[PDB]
Design a protein around this nucleic acid. Sequence first.
RNA 1: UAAUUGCGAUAACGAACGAGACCUUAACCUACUAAAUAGUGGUGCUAGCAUUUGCUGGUUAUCCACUUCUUAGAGGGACUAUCGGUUUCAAGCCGAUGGAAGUUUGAGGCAAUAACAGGUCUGUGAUGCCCUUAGACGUUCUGGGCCGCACGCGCGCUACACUGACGGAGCCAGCGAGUCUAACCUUGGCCGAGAGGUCUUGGUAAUCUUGUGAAACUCCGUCGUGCUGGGGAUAGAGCAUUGUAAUUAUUGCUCUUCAACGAGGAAUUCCUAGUAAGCGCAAGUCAUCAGCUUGCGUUGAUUACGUCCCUGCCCUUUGUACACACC
Lengths: 54, 145, 141, 104, 69, 143, 67, 168, 53, 103
Amino acid sequence: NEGAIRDKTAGRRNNRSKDVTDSATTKKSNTRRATDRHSRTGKTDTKKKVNQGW
Amino acid sequence: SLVVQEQGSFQHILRLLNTNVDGNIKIVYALTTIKGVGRRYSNLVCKKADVDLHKRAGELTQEELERIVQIMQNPTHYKIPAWFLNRQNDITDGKDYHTLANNVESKLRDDLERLKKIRAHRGIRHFWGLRVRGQHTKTTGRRRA
Amino acid sequence: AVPSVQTFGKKKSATAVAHVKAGKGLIKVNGSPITLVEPEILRFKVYEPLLLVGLDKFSNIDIRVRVTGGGHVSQVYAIRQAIAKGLVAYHQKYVDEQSKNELKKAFTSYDRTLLIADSRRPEPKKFGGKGARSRFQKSYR
Amino acid sequence: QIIKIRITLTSTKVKQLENVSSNIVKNAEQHNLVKKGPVRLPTKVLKISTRKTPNGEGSKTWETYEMRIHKRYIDLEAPVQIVKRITQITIEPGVDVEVVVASN
Amino acid sequence: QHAVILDQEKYDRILKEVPTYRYVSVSVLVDRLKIGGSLARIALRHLEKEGIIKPISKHSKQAIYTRAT
Amino acid sequence: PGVSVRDVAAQDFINAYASFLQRQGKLEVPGYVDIVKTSSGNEMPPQDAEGWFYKRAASVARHIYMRKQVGVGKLNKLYGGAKSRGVRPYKHIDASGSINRKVLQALEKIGIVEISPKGGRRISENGQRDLDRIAAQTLEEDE
Amino acid sequence: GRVRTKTVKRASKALIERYYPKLTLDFQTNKRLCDEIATIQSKRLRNKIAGYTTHLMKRIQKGPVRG
Amino acid sequence: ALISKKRKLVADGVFYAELNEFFTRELAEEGYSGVEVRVTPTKTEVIIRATRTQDVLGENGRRINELTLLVQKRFKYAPGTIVLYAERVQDRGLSAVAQAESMKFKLLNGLAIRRAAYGVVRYVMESGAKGCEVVVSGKLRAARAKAMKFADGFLIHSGQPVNDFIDT
Amino acid sequence: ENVWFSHPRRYGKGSRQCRVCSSHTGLIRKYGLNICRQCFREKANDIGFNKFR
Amino acid sequence: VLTDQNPIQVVVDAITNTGPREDTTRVGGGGAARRQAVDVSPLRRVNQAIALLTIGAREAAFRNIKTIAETLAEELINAAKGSSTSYAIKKKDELERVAKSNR
RNA sequence: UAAUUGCGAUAACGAACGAGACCUUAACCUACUAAAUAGUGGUGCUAGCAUUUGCUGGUUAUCCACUUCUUAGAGGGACUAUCGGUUUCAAGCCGAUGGAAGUUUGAGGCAAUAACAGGUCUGUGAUGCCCUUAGACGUUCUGGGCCGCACGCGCGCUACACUGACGGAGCCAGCGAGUCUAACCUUGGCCGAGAGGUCUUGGUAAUCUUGUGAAACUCCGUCGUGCUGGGGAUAGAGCAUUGUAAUUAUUGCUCUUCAACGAGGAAUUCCUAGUAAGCGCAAGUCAUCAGCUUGCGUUGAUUACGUCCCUGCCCUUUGUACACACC
Ligand SMILES: [Mg+2]
Ligand SMILES: [Mg+2]
Ligand SMILES: [Mg+2]
Ligand SMILES: [Mg+2]
Ligand SMILES: [Mg+2]
Ligand SMILES: [Mg+2]
Ligand SMILES: [Mg+2]
Ligand SMILES: [Mg+2]
Ligand SMILES: [Mg+2]
Ligand SMILES: [Mg+2]
Ligand SMILES: [Mg+2]
Ligand SMILES: [Mg+2]
Ligand SMILES: [Mg+2]
Ligand SMILES: [Mg+2]
Ligand SMILES: [Mg+2]
Ligand SMILES: [Mg+2]
Ligand SMILES: [Mg+2]
Ligand SMILES: [Mg+2]
Ligand SMILES: [Mg+2]
Ligand SMILES: [Mg+2]
Ligand SMILES: [Mg+2]
Ligand SMILES: [Mg+2]
Ligand SMILES: [Mg+2]
Ligand SMILES: [Mg+2]
Ligand SMILES: [Mg+2]
Ligand SMILES: [Mg+2]
Ligand SMILES: [Mg+2]
Ligand SMILES: [Mg+2]
Ligand SMILES: [Mg+2]
Ligand SMILES: [Mg+2]
Ligand SMILES: [Mg+2]
Ligand SMILES: [Mg+2]
Ligand SMILES: [Mg+2]
Ligand SMILES: [Mg+2]
Ligand SMILES: [Mg+2]
Ligand SMILES: [Mg+2]
Ligand SMILES: [Mg+2]
Ligand SMILES: [Mg+2]
Ligand SMILES: [Zn+2]
């Protein structure tokens, strides 16, 4: 604590003087919706497989 | 029916405990302007002081003002119990006080300085200016100042 | 045996039970005079059964009423309904039927439920809001 | 040797407990014991409310399950056999039966 | 500001005026002269002692009052 | 031709009975009586410090009279109101126990009430007299 | 609102077809008729059936029906 | 003793549920379709309904003795205060549980899909039901999974009838 | 054989569990059910809890 | 107290005098949209009159100490024989002045 | 028509799923069967006021009678009834009357064929595969963290006050839960301003808590438009409770501290009758902790009885080079 309390900088008004990173007002950005139907595995199947089991 | 006139007997803006009380209001509420007296303490004070509470503060002859004051700074001796008192079982001194007027600001700082000298986590939070009790600081208390 | 009758009336969950027997004509609610009913401004609502048919009709009968359930307004309407409903059920039994129908027809002409229970009951609160129809507030983006 | 007996029947299915009550009611006053007929005790509804969802997602959908418990009692006055008979002769799955000596 | 005590000039104002108004209440006394409204109320029960004011209704929220007679 | 306290309105009765027990002079109003709020759910002390305890004592008299027996815990819940939690929602909080318990105790000293069996406190034949007697006074006072 | 289904309008067209001499212009009696000349599984259905047939009968005596 | 009636009936229903499962895991190979618990004064009765009864009640009363002893130890019954019985079944082709266990046992045994689902739908039909439905979900082979709905006959899905005449 | 292997288990979640699946999460304790609400809907029929409304 | 008369006779008069005789509806209007002058049902004349007067009394008495009862009377008496110092009288006259325009 | 609900039109006829029927719950039953674990009248015994007999009580059984209120079995009841106005003279709609109820009587349960790479492998001793498996990604123990605060955004709680606050006083709910091989729901007495403490008690419960004497609300008073006695954030000091453990304040209590907030910009949500909104209560969780939720009742409206302007959605037509189907 004696470290902490003594520390300048890390006090409050200092945080208040700094302007707030643009990443605070940011959007979540949603990161890949429009690829959702397309299968990214690239394997797919074969009518011989789709047939035996079903 | 208290309907009454007087002449010079009513006086607006008198002064006690280094503060200016409103000369127009009821005395229980006129006194609460003093730091350290709330509605419950001013109310009990007028009661031990043989003061008719139906009066405005602009009534209350100087005698009666002197009674309110002595009682105010000696509550423990007027049958006012210890649990009615804002600073109890002090820390150092150890006795039952009721602090008033500009001393409330003082003793408050003393306490604050105390655990700040001791560097307990609570004074740390005071020093920074953060919330002292256990609340979440994430969403609330913005706009600061 | 004595000539008694027992009627009731209801508004919401309040239910008032009335005892009409031949007698000196005291009208009491919860063992207390009907003049002291103090939902207050509503007091004539319990006076109404008497003032429509006439005050003379209660000279030959005592009225005991007792209420439970509901709230302070709904008990007013449950005793005013059990008082008007006990008057006719005393006349249905113990006096002529053409008189009972002048009682009923003076009530129903002015009635506010007066002899016929109000059927409004509370709706249930469904999940998704604070009430039956009230929904919690939504957001979208 | 007439006792004063209290039979209490509690069950979740109405139609089995109704005709166990009616089989105690008929057989008791068939040969004339006293009566003290079935006293219906308010049916207790045990409600449970959970979210339909496992995990947390989707519209916040609430299902509420009921178990309904129905109680009644009958009071018979009779000795010896018609005590231990009327207990054990009128019996049925899902119907809970208990018989009390008197009072305490 | 308003007046929370009588000046004896305000006491004279009261009795030589209030019989003029047909309607008197808590607010009529406050607006018409100036009064703390706590001492309008004390004026109302006092003006009623020997009526220059006749109650047609009273209540905790509202006091309704009429000219002397 | 005979009167019961049920024949006198609630407020007019407790009014003229709480100004009767203050005249009577024998109550035993407790030693605090000026510093108390009557409820942990209240804010300020009662505005009439003089006659509030007789006001409550006359209430508890008229309230136990109309019933079989009632205890301290039931007077608390009866006199406890809505407590402002501040920025948190209101809820009901029971009133002060020492107030009511010392009303039942002090009422026992004039004999307006007595220990009941079953528990609680019940109106006493003497106190049934005194309430009914002033029930008539208030009734007869208004002629 | 209030519209009667086919399962109700088909019992009403079927009864009147056979039982016309036995039916009436009064709901109450035909209700009872439905317990005799029909087996209907719930009380409401019976009430709903008879209530329609009589509506038919009522306007049958008015004029002939396409039904 | 001394439970509440609200809590006791609830604790009883739990006792049905946990017992019903145990026999499903243990008697699965014998075709267990369900149980009934009978509480009578002195001897609570437990009745097991499983299409292979002789495998339930084992060699000369054994293995129904294993099952009672397990129940006894489990639920803290004094020996003899609880008894196990065995029934054959009423028309196993009319039981949901029976056909689902029958299906699981067809696939697992090396059958294929349509034949097993059409086999069971036909048996439920020839056993005199009104209708039949068998729905196999999951991946019957190869990565992406689909569903197969096999059905025949008549089914109502909607009202209180769904409780009376259909079991799933 | 040696203490040092445990800590007070007397109350709170984690003295509890669904008597089926052992989850301490979202248990239904009402009426002493002690089944988690996820298993409780699976067994609600066999327990005799049904939905009329 | 103020008017004698019948206190109920004047609320009637106030309600009759504060119903807007004709009114305005919002036409589709092609972007910035023209308002059409339409006459108003006598049930709406009663509905809207009662709203105007209570709203008038609600706004006046808010941060005035004066009670709702006194402001309602101040509202109702003024509206009875229309003063134009009443909230509802002012709103009606403006609602009719606009109707007379945009026809 | 809420409805592929029907009337009709008819190369269609006759039908099935879904809809409806169904079930549950809320309204009516002075009709049936009963009840000290529900009540009511009478009689005993007994208190007080009155003297006129009467009024108001007390007594868990003194005793008799009843089922109106309460409980829940079995039934009954609505069918949109009756008359009238419309229309293809069709299904239906609208009006009035009567009725407990005429909006599918209110509100729910259930709910077709297909579809989504929607969420859930952190509910599961459901699980394929990969990963790790003794310096473990197993498990336990100590402590810390999930709450960390320049800020952006969602659900909310408290407010700006006089249709109020404060003090007395009046005083009325419904849904509920609750103690065994064990600490529950707790009356009553006593102590304590309080929170709380304590000695006892009833209840495994229509029996005791409990009339849950809840809150809004009503009456009388005080304050008087002044960030005021509106508001109660932030903080200081002291006392209690839960717990092995309360510091980064679990919660509660006491006195003091008395901030923003003066009706909220562009936007935007929910709602048609016991509903909106106001109000509290129980249940879940819970050792302690509700500003949350699931239900419950109390007080109780203004406005509509409509339209396709806006925002969705569906259907028909239509176009297609799409069909893994405009990701
Ligand atoms: Mg101060
Ligand atoms: Mg916080
Ligand atoms: Mg900021
Ligand atoms: Mg109740
Ligand atoms: Mg989870
Ligand atoms: Mg209260
Ligand atoms: Mg109160
Ligand atoms: Mg608050
Ligand atoms: Mg056909
Ligand atoms: Mg069907
Ligand atoms: Mg359906
Ligand atoms: Mg351990
Ligand atoms: Mg169509
Ligand atoms: Mg069909
Ligand atoms: Mg029925
Ligand atoms: Mg009518
Ligand atoms: Mg419906
Ligand atoms: Mg579905
Ligand atoms: Mg995905
Ligand atoms: Mg899973
Ligand atoms: Mg999780
Ligand atoms: Mg978290
Ligand atoms: Mg932290
Ligand atoms: Mg949300
Ligand atoms: Mg108040
Ligand atoms: Mg206690
Ligand atoms: Mg102390
Ligand atoms: Mg009871
Ligand atoms: Mg109860
Ligand atoms: Mg202030
Ligand atoms: Mg305040
Ligand atoms: Mg921390
Ligand atoms: Mg601390
Ligand atoms: Mg919108
Ligand atoms: Mg916590
Ligand atoms: Mg809680
Ligand atoms: Mg939550
Ligand atoms: Mg079409
Ligand atoms: Zn589980």
